[PDB]
Design a protein around this ligand. Structure first.
Ligand SMILES: Nc1ncnc2c1ncn2[C@@H]1O[C@H](COP(=O)(O)OP(=O)(O)OP(=O)(O)O)[C@@H](O)[C@H]1O
Ligand SMILES: Nc1ncnc2c1ncn2[C@@H]1O[C@H](COP(=O)(O)OP(=O)(O)OP(=O)(O)O)[C@@H](O)[C@H]1O
Ligand SMILES: Nc1ncnc2c1ncn2[C@@H]1O[C@H](COP(=O)(O)OP(=O)(O)OP(=O)(O)O)[C@@H](O)[C@H]1O
Ligand SMILES: Nc1ncnc2c1ncn2[C@@H]1O[C@H](COP(=O)(O)OP(=O)(O)OP(=O)(O)O)[C@@H](O)[C@H]1O
Ligand SMILES: Nc1ncnc2c1ncn2[C@@H]1O[C@H](COP(=O)(O)OP(=O)(O)OP(=O)(O)O)[C@@H](O)[C@H]1O
Ligand code: MOO
Ligand code: MOO
Ligand SMILES: [Mg+2]
Ligand SMILES: [Mg+2]
Ligand SMILES: [Mg+2]
Ligand SMILES: [Mg+2]
Lengths: 267, 272, 267, 272, 55
């Protein structure tokens, strides 16, 4: 049925629904199905320094012996400073994105300097960095997290804060390369009903779907909400897990598929 | 048999370490490439204040473009202090921190250029400054850049803090290009005997003028690097550098015209 | 006798024949003598899609275990579209080359996405990608065939069509790096007397030399003719083999040295 | 089943080897992109002499900018000869040596641009030249570049010496851009029957004018590549090329104005 | 004759810095015929032709 697809592609517009339906009926190809993507928070982890980073480095050099790892970095509070400045100036979301990309790259550089002795490099070209992943003595890479939408970012309905930040970068990199597992390493056991750092009555949530997550009408979340709309629309990766990287072992247990933190499912 | 294949030249068969052999060739004073250039180093402590300090500065610059050909180099500020705190908690060496701060400088520059784009201003990255500066300035009037020099993993040791920061890079550029003047913009009227934001605030005396030597021999903090004072001694073209407060309108404009509105630092250069 | 060479180099002009003769008397160093170069046609193979590419991916993932592979891509029909457009405008060969380079790079990207799970990367740097070509886990790289003469392309005697395209890029990369054999994977069993897709009386040709190939006064060939003048002038690689990639095993057998399709010899 | 997916076009289902099928589409003469451009190839043997030859040349160029829009390409010179010496001792192939020489060309260009920066001149890398020379020339008047073409690891075999050198690349550019003129600057008055700096310099006779064929069908050295003649044979726009001595002031200017001060080489082009 | 010339010049501007000076032509011949019928001297006719050039 590819002839109809081809003649439509050549004739109709890509907005033609007959065409979209033909395309959805096409094949699926996972590029790194054996790979696992994790996101190291900047404000939650790296900005804590030694105590939170050295243990994770250990966990990573340990885990790479059994899993392929794509370690994306987050930006942190330097990015929030930059966003404050640039918003005070009235500059748009694209600029702010250009700025945060850099913070994520700094954090990646630091992490890579920590991991180089273990054979784990920093790569711009993360997805097709094929070699380090084909090897068992490397089996991992650090790809700073912020996406490339630098000045073309989709602005939010209200404000200049870029909505598609590091979380989205890592998740989309996973969904594209058909990875098997997507993990978010942060400073909390998982998702609660409210920011526990501000509200100590907040209740833990071990598992939930996107629809339920929206129905709860959360004012603040541990993830960027747009990531939810993306997850509801993905095809390869249909769930993500959030864990605490300050707790030792949690990351290793998660890589093994264990449920230690919070699990968010599209459906 | 295995003898060296030499290219005939005055410096052939030399190590370039014996000055008595290089002086006949390289011992003369160089030239100015962009003698018509004015360099302005904005400090990061300024940009960190945000609109309150940038918008007035931006208007001043907007009014300066038709008067000068400007290279506006930005500094890092406090984000660099944060990345230092982290990298030191991790035990990273100075050569690993240098680029991490250069980046904050570059981001401040991107901000400023965004605010000035309506006037034809843009950010260059540093390869372009080194090579394609004259043309980027024949097109427009001002360009923005980063002041931290690219000594990123080749930073000098001795200190856990990259000694070659924005001030130093700005001066090195200006003295290489043989620029007309270098002007530094800080959050204070100029240089004092002590930090007027610190505990010795009361004993701080403003220094309207001084030399690089009087400071380098001194001890204590400064709004400028000490490596700057070291390179000043080896300067070739720049004779004086003015430090001025950019929070105060009109002082930058005046300094570009040679007025004494802040602190004057004389280098080791001897005039004609 | 290197002193004469040196004094000539420093004194005479490089057009001095005494100098050229001295230089020809110099040594010969092979950089990747154990490596084999292959060119995957775009219009003949990749533009066919799944049926022609998946089997070849299998063959390649199989062969890299015993051979060292530099896989150059062709451009295809998108390039022919571009060439038609740009010629309708009267734009010169250099521009057309700039354009086809991209088509060859796109096809390479696709192939690399297919092969990444097997540890085979896409490299701008084919000659000095020393690591992958060294590891038996990889032992292969995908580059893109179109050469770097982008705007400095030598125009043809008549027209604006760039004469030196993917075929030439791959062959020259072989001759430079002293590779052992050079193969062209296409949609035909080899070279005939005429385009079999048009003429049905076209006769096969298992083996031939460049001189005989010109004497035949072929109106159309399976290779760019300039490649012949290059082959007649090469030092390391003195023959190439053209095979059909739609036939399974032909490529593997050729890598072993067999005479599967057509063999073209400089002499 | 496995049929080819074609994009409909006049050249579809073609190999581009059959000229009878491409001529209806690509058999016509192209256009000029930068017909208002003047190209000047400085030889490296000139720049190797240093100030004695560069400063006068620099002043001449300084006086030419307001008159023309200039692309000044540079050659390599003797350093390329040294790197050839080494690479041949090591047995490297011609494709390995080509870039090593292109680099010396680029460095000569960086030098010249440094000397001319005060006038708005800068050095532009091969991709800038190719994709975006028009804007870099709308900004300023002249730009400097390297003449060696990027055939670096893909150079043609047959010789252990790269045949495609500065002259060739300059001509290929100019004929692609459809430039107004190409002018070559050497350390000799022009072309002779033999190397006037060689053993048979006594029999060397000057050639005020000639054709690419007469030279290419001859044998002996030349101040220009032979691949240059081979490409001249296939030129489209450029009808003549003048070789002039740059050690002599005023000849470059005149040549740009069309004067016959050196050697004229007619290409295979047939004017109207 | 002018339109082709104008296009040529349009294509020359980016190549040169041009001073294009025009001549008079036939109208000057007419004003000469008249001034000579009237007996005017050459100094009286010169500007009258310069003007046709300027136009
Ligand atoms: N509903 C919630 N459940 C759990 N944590 C929450 C919730 N709402 C807010 N948070 C807080 O959000 C923080 C994580 O978000 P933040 O973006 O600051 O860190 P990060 O995303 O890891 O860093 P970066 O954004 O730089 O990548 C946690 O410290 C957590 O306390
Ligand atoms: N002797 C002194 N005289 C004046 N100010 C001083 C002195 N010593 C310290 N300071 C203080 O140093 C601060 C500037 O520090 P610093 O020079 O690191 O920032 P900056 O130069 O504005 O930013 P950057 O270093 O990124 O360019 C000023 O705010 C000032 O209060
Ligand atoms: N004498 C010949 N013998 C064999 N095949 C020929 C001959 N003349 C023309 N051909 C045709 O040439 C085609 C291959 O050339 P073509 O350039 O179209 O494909 P390709 O070179 O593999 O793709 P690309 O040019 O994009 O790399 C074959 O499909 C074949 O039918
Ligand atoms: N037939 C000839 N007529 C004139 N000069 C010749 C001839 N044959 C050789 N030469 C010599 O060749 C020299 C130039 O060599 P070459 O062309 O390699 O240098 P260049 O072109 O100036 O530098 P580059 O090759 O880097 O551009 C001249 O100095 C000249 O003496
Ligand atoms: N020896 C000659 N060679 C060529 N043309 C000549 C010669 N003698 C006379 N003519 C004629 O003279 C005419 C030009 O006359 P004239 O020079 O007065 O006009 P013009 O120069 O075009 O206008 P203006 O004088 O206002 O610039 C030409 O059309 C030409 O036919
Ligand atoms: O701190 Mo972020 O990663 O820009 O949201
Ligand atoms: O289709 Mo190409 O441009 O001959 O390789
Ligand atoms: Mg040394
Ligand atoms: Mg300071
Ligand atoms: Mg082909
Ligand atoms: Mg020459």
């Amino acid at each position: 049925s590819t002839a109809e697809l081809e003649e439509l592609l050549m004739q109709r517009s890509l907005t033609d629904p007959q065409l979209q339906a033909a395309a959805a009926a096409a094949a699926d190809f996972r590029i790194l199905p054996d790979a696992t993507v994790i996101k190291i928070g900047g404000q939650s982890v790296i900005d804590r320094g030694r105590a939170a980073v050295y243990p994770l480095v250990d966990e990573i050099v340990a885990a790479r012996k059994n899993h392929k790892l794509l370690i994306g970095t987050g930006a942190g509070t330097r990015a929030r400073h930059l966003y404050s400045i640039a918003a005070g100036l009235g500059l748009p979301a694209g600029v702010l994105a250009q700025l945060g990309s850099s913070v994520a790259d700094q954090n990646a550089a630091m992490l890579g300097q920590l991991l180089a002795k273990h054979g784990i490099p920093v790569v711009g070209g993360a997805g097709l960095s094929a070699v380090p992943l084909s090897l068992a003595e490397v089996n991992a890479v650090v790809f700073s997290g912020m996406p490339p939408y630098k000045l073309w970012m989709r602005p939010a309905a209200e404000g200049v804060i870029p909505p598609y930040r590091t979380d989205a970068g890592c998740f989309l990199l996973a969904e594209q390369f058909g990875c098997k597992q997507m993990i978010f390493v942060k400073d909390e056991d998982g998702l609660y009903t409210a920011n526990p750092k501000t509200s100590k009555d907040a209740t833990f949530i071990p598992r939930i779907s996107v629809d339920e997550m929206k129905a709860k009408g959360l004012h603040d979340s541990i993830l960027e909400f747009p990531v939810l709309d993306l997850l509801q629309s993905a095809q390869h990766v249909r769930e993500v897990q959030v864990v605490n990287g300050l707790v030792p072992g949690n990351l290793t247990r998660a890589l093994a598929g264990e449920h230690v933190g919070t699990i968010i499912t599209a459906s | 048999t295995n003898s060296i294949k030499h290219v005939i030249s005055p410096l052939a068969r030399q190590t370039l370490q014996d000055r008595d052999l290089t002086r006949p060739v390289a011992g003369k004073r160089p030239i100015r490439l962009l003698p018509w250039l004015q360099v302005v180093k904005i400090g990061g402590r300024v940009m960190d204040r945000g609109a309150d300090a940038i918008l007035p500065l931006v208007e001043e610059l907007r009014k300066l473009l038709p008067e000068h050909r400007l290279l506006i180099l930005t500094g890092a500020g406090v984000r660099a202090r944060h990345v230092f705190s982290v990298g030191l908690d991790l035990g990273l060496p100075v050569g690993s921190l240098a680029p991490l701060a250069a980046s904050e400088a570059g981001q401040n520059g991107h901000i400023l250029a965004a605010m000035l784009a309506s006037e034809g201003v843009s950010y260059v990255e540093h390869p372009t400054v080194a090579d394609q500066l004259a043309i980027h300035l024949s097109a427009t009037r001002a360009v923005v850049g980063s002041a931290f020099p690219p000594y990123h993993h080749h930073e000098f040791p001795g200190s856990r803090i990259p000694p070659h920061r924005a001030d130093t890079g700005a001066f090195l550029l200006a003295d290489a290009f043989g620029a007309a003047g270098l002007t530094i913009v800080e959050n204070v009227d100029g240089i004092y005997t002590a930090d007027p934001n610190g505990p010795d605030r009361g004993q701080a005396r403003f220094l309207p003028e001084t030399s690089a030597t009087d400071l380098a021999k001194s001890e204590g903090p400064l709004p400028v690097d000490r490596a700057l004072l070291d390179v000043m001694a080896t300067a070739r073209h720049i004779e004086r550098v003015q430090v001025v407060n950019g929070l105060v309108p009109g002082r930058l404009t005046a300094a570009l015209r040679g007025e004494h509105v802040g602190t004057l630092i004389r280098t080791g250069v001897r005039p004609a």
